[PDB]
Ligand binder design. Structure first.
Ligand code: ZN
Ligand code: ZN
Lengths: 263, 394, 605
């Protein structure tokens, strides 16, 4: 079976900027597209299961743990729960000017441990191939690099595919993230037609992904820079403690304070 | 299989059968691997697309999956070339199906199927039902020929009996549908209920027959609501086989003992065990009745006690080979009808006459060294005329 | 007594089922048949108890089959198991109770034991009995009076009629006791025989000896052990323990030679103290005590030579502490059984490996020698490695068309020479022997028909042994087979199965069979059971081939012959065709060669 997790980056600052701009695309339509994708994923098979996470500057919250209109009861419950919870989360939110960048990585960690919990609980008879369909919507924060890299490596070890679906911006950190675990990277330039991209590129599971034509991966610039002025460097002088990429040979690296002996 | 059953249908019945509630989902689940995704893809498109795109939308490796899926779904007629947009009706129904718009039961099903099999075999005590009896008789696995005397069991009956419960029930329901069309019950309406289970007068009669088979049980004096059993949606062994053709079966239900006695000689019957011997007499008796060694071997393997599961193969090679050899020794001599002409004189002229009886299908065996050909009396009036024509041609 | 709708002896209303049936792994049928589970955790204890009280008839890998009888129950009482001591544990082990029929049978058999005892003293056989009523009501029939020579009441009985009286008592329900109190016996001084520490006794040998030695007294009985299990060693150990004059009886020259070799190898007794009472060669039989001889010589009915007459008179006059008889399955024969009465012995131990025969004379052994003390488990020995694992196989050879034509056409019995010699099986044995010869596997070909054996042996220029085969030439051929690498095959006749000291062989092909006899089949199979120095059970190093001819009475003979082996558990794999036979060049391929062979067979007459 397959356990899909949709990590939606519903950043109020950026989505409300879109709302003020009165652009055609809106967070409501984005949520509807994600809902349709999840419904189709479960539609694929009974054993398949899904979950949803929404990201905010403060924290990240799960959007998912009759036939009034003649509809599959389970998908109806999914629609109702996600709609109600997303509206509640968006309606209620404190204001903090100091922190405005979206905390995308923190949710990833929640997704990973949730997948681990589900893998533990599920019977050993059936093998579960989990996936994380990250949908970024705003620029990433520099300060989150370390933790995001930790979670990416944890996902690599635990065999989960991070399929990035960045839109309106190309996050180098996120493309690097999905490249490590082999997840697909699609940058949709036509936001109104986003759902067609999901039902082709992302929706097919890892089982059938190899035996299918999908957009080629984007080249990844694995840049390195010294800790002084933040710029690309091809040669780094790291020590045996900090393991920090530096500018030039120095008597002692500041982040270490070690008694380096010249030679 | 259900894929065969649905493939053997016309477009007119197919589109009607694609009902809104369940059919669009039950037939979807059939889609083995990839057709699920392509259909999902083009569930939201109102514009047909070229076939070349679908052709090139699968890598060079594992293309046979692409062709087989495309052929299967073309047979199902989910889309039309229109020049590959899906059928509008199926698209709408599928969108409505995708965000749009027990312990006693299993025992009951087991007991009902067991009593049905008891009646199928010559059990003096069994459930009595004229409709069930006539349905089984017309299913092709039973023939009576005398209403007063209880019906006997035909050759196909034993083969059906020795099948496993899942395949047995599935074939029984397939025959039920085929005979439903003959008796006049609408096929589409009854078929849709089976798909709806895994999630009118004709409906009531069909549900009554299903309840008689034990797949469903209203439990409320035949109320509208029903609670399907496990078998409606669609175990450890007990026989121990020795190397001396001896079977020790931990059987308490008389059905298993009867099934074993069908092809073995019973020796002792303990309260929780029974001893039988697989001898030439019993095995050849079963083979003459109609069974073949494959069914017996499969039956013994599926009902294999856990003790003998450790050894590989589970069933001893000596027992398996002996059963197969016993079945093979059954047939030798033959039977056919024919007439022989001779003196074919010219060698090149006899070769032309051999093609006349071979095309019509009346040639049995020939001989180019002695100029002899055997012709069945069914086509004797056509070969002689041809020979006369050849003679006239000279 | 109750028959189900099938051949099913119904026992639903006969006996109940124990609630803890899963815990109890034992079954008890009213007829006495018992079915033990080889997978139960208490299987070893159940096996020991059931072997003690019953004799195996079928011991496959999963479910062993035993049946108990009067003789087995008498043996249990002899080893000292009382009626309660056996029945209480039988009920405890049984998962379905004990039928009243078996209960009463056990009670009667146990109580009817020990009342009548037979003790020979001063060359006089007295029928002692502490209870006098047994004799009082046993003297009803006149046969006892005419038999008898013309508390603790005893009367002398005639020497010649001992066998008749014993078989009469067996059905009279008063078995005689043949226990020997060698611990308390001053009439015959003990012999200076001891068992050297070099001899090693295997666990099954020790168990059989323990069954044989119930107490200080040496019990006379039959111990069935596989030929490769070391029955010769067991017999030598028994003689050494007895420490009195021992007379071992073989069945042939090879048997006597092997017995002398075993005596010298395993016993410290000097060479001069062992004699071979054999016509071919003798070592002053009167000079020494420990003797090895043959049934034919001792029971010889025609005129006796002067020296043999003197030796026979000396043997008759002397009394023997132990009388070992190998291959007891031949004892009930007329001449062979006459030897029992001809010679005098306190305890006559019997050793063999195939205690089975068609005529119902095996039961006579129970009184001729004694109850069957032990039967070794061939499968357990194979698992323990004491006996080489054998991949028993039956190669089916399709009969050639012409040969089948004459075979079916003639209603006479030239078929024995015909189907034994057909191109398909002649090519088969040749190809099999070639394949094993290039594999460095030792071959022992077998064939009942001496004519066919000689023809095959001359065609394959191999050293066939059979019939007259001088003893010197026999020994030379056996030595060459054992030592010379250039030769690795010997073609032995029926004499091989009688009693042969032969080196372990990797394969055993049998081109012809005497009949559907389970004795000959097991006897010949026992040759390859000799465990190798460092082999493994799963390697299947040992192979047994029983070549048969398709669509012939030989098929019936082979099926009527593999019953005992399949009962033990060996699975005979059928081989319709052999790979590489077509490519390998063999005789009788073209039609012409088969034609000349058929012409020779027809001219054989
Ligand atoms: Zn720098
Ligand atoms: Zn440092």
């Amino acid at each position: 079976l397959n356990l899909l997790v949709i990590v939606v980056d519903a950043n109020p600052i950026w989505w409300g900027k879109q709302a003020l701009k009165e652009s055609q695309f809106t967070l409501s339509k984005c949520i509807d597209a994600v809902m349709v994708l999840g419904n189709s994923h479960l539609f694929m098979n009974r054993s398949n299961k899904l979950a949803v996470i929404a990201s905010h500057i403060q924290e990240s919250r799960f959007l998912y743990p009759g036939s009034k209109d003649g509809k599959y009861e389970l998908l109806t419950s999914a629609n109702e729960v996600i709609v109600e919870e997303i509206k509640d989360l968006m309606t209620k939110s404190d204001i903090k000017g100091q922190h405005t960048e979206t905390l995308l990585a923190g949710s990833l960690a929640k997704a990973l441990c949730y997948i681990h919990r589900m893998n533990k609980e599920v019977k050993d008879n059936q093998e579960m191939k989990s996936r994380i369909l990250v949908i970024k919507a705003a620029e990433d924060s520099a300060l989150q690099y370390m933790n995001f890299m930790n979670v990416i490596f944890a996902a690599q070890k635990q065999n989960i595919l991070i399929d990035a679906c960045v839109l309106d911006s190309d996050s180098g950190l996120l493309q690097q993230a999905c490249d490590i675990t082999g997840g697909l990277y699609l940058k949709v330039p036509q936001m109104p037609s986003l759902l067609q991209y999901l039902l082709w590129v992302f929706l097919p599971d890892q089982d059938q992904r190899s035996q299918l034509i999908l957009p080629p991966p984007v080249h990844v610039d694995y840049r390195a820079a010294c800790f002084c002025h933040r710029n690309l460097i091809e040669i780094g002088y790291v020590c045996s403690v900090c393991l920090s990429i530096f500018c030039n040979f120095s008597p002692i690296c500041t982040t270490c304070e070690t008694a380096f002996k010249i030679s | 299989n259900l894929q065969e059953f649905l493939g053997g249908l016309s477009p007119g019945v197919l589109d009607r059968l694609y009902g809104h509630p369940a059919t669009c989902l039950a037939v979807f689940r059939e889609l083995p691997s990839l057709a699920k995704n392509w259909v999902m893809r083009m569930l939201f498109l109102e514009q047909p697309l070229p076939q070349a795109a679908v052709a090139l939308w699968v890598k060079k490796e594992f293309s046979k999956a692409q062709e087989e899926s495309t052929g299967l779904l073309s047979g199902l007629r989910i889309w039309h070339t229109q020049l590959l947009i899906l059928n509008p009706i199926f698209r709408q129904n599928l969108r409505i199906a995708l965000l749009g718009g027990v312990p006693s039961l299993d025992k009951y099903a087991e007991e009902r199927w067991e009593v049905v099999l008891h009646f199928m075999v010559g059990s003096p005590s069994a459930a009595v039902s004229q409709d069930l009896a006539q349905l089984l008789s017309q299913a092709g696995l039973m023939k009576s020929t005398e209403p007063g005397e209880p019906p006997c069991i035909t050759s196909a009956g034993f083969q059906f009996l020795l099948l496993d419960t899942p395949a047995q029930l599935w074939y029984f329901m397939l025959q039920y549908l085929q005979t439903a069309q003959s008796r006049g019950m609408d096929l589409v309406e009854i078929l849709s209920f089976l798909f709806q289970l895994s999630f009118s007068d004709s409906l009531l009669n069909f549900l009554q027959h299903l309840r008689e088979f034990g797949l469903v049980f209203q439990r409320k004096r035949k109320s509208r609501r029903y609670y399907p059993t496990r078998l409606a949606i669609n175990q450890p062994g007990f026989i121990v086989v020795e190397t001396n053709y001896r079977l020790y079966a931990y059987t308490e239900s008389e059905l298993q003992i009867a099934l074993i006695a069908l092809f073995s000689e019973m020796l002792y019957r303990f309260p929780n065990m029974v001893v039988a011997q697989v001898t030439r007499e019993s095995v050849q008796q079963a083979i003459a009745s109609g069974i073949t060694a494959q069914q017996i071997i499969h039956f013994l393997r599926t009902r294999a006690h856990p003790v003998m599961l450790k050894q590989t193969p589970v069933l001893p090679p000596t027992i398996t080979d002996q059963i197969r050899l016993w079945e093979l020794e059954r047939d030798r001599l033959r039977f056919t009808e024919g007439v022989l002409y001779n003196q074919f004189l010219s060698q090149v002229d006899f070769e032309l006459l051999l093609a006349h009886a071979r095309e019509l299908g009346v040639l049995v065996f020939e001989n180019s060294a002695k100029r002899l050909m055997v012709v069945t009396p069914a086509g004797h009036s056509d070969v002689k005329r041809f020979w006369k024509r050849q003679k006239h041609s000279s | 007594t109750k028959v189900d709708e099938y051949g099913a002896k119904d026992y639903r209303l006969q006996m109940p089922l124990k609630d803890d049936h899963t815990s109890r792994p034992l079954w008890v049928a009213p007829d006495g048949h018992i079915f033990l589970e080889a997978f139960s955790p208490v299987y070893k204890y159940a096996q020991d108890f059931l072997v003690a009280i019953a004799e195996p008839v079928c011991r496959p890998t999963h479910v062993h089959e035993y049946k108990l009888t009067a003789y087995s129950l008498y043996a249990a009482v002899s080893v000292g198991l009382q009626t309660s001591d056996i029945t209480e544990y039988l009920r405890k082990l049984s998962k379905t109770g004990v039928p009243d029929g078996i209960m009463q049978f056990i009670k009667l058999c146990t109580v009817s034991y020990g009342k009548v005892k037979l003790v020979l003293k001063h060359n006089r056989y007295f029928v002692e009995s502490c209870h006098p009523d047994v004799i009082q009501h046993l003297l009803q029939d006149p046969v006892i009076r005419e038999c008898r020579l013309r508390q603790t009441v005893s009367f002398e009985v005639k020497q010649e009629m001992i066998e008749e009286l014993q078989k009469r008592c067996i059905h009279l329900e008063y078995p005689l006791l043949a226990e020997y109190d060698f611990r308390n016996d001053s009439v015959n001084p003990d012999i200076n025989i001891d068992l050297k520490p070099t001899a090693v006794l295997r666990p099954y040998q020790e168990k059989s000896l323990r069954k044989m030695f119930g107490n200080g007294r040496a019990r006379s009985g039959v111990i069935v052990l596989p030929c490769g299990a070391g029955k010769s060693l067991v017999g030598v150990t028994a003689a050494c323990t007895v420490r009195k004059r021992c007379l071992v009886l073989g069945n042939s020259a090879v048997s006597v030679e092997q017995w002398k070799a075993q005596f010298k190898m395993w016993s410290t007794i000097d060479d001069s103290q062992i004699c071979r009472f054999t016509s071919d060669a003798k070592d002053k039989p009167i000079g020494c005590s420990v003797a090895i001889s043959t049934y034919s010589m001792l029971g010889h009915t025609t005129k006796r030579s002067w020296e043999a007459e003197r030796v026979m008179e000396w043997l008759k006059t002397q009394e023997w502490g132990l009388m070992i008889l190998d291959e007891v399955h031949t004892i009930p024969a007329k001449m062979f059984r006459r030897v029992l009465t001809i010679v005098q012995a306190h305890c006559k131990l019997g050793l063999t490996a195939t205690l089975v025969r068609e005529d119902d004379k095996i039961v006579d052994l129970n009184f001729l020698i004694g109850p069957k003390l032990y039967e070794a488990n061939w499968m357990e020995l194979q698992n323990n490695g004491y006996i080489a694992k054998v991949q028993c196989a039956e190669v089916w050879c399709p009969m050639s068309p012409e040969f089948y034509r004459e075979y079916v056409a003639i209603k006479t019995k030239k078929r024995i020479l015909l189907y034994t010699m057909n191109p398909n099986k002649f090519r088969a044995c040749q190809f099999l022997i070639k394949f094993h010869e290039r594999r460095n596997d030792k071959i022992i070909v077998f064939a009942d028909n001496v004519f066919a054996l000689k023809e095959y042996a001359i065609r394959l220029n191999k050293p066939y042994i059979y019939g007259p085969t001088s003893q010197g030439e026999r020994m030379q051929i056996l030595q060459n087979f054992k030592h010379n690498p250039k030769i690795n095959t010997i073609f032995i006749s029926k004499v091989g199965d009688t009693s042969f000291d032969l080196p372990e062989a990797n394969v055993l092909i049998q081109i012809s069979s005497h009949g559907g006899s389970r004795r000959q089949e097991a006897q010949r199979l026992g040759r390859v059971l000799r465990a190798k120095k460092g082999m493994v059970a799963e390697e299947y190093n040992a192979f047994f081939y029983s070549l048969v001819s398709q669509d012939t009475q030989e098929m019936a003979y082979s099926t009527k012959r593999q019953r005992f082996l399949v009962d033990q558990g060996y699975s005979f794999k059928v081989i319709t065709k052999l790979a590489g036979m077509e490519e390998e060049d063999l005789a009788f391929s073209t039609k012409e060669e088969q034609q000349q062979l058929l012409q020779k067979v027809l001219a054989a007459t």
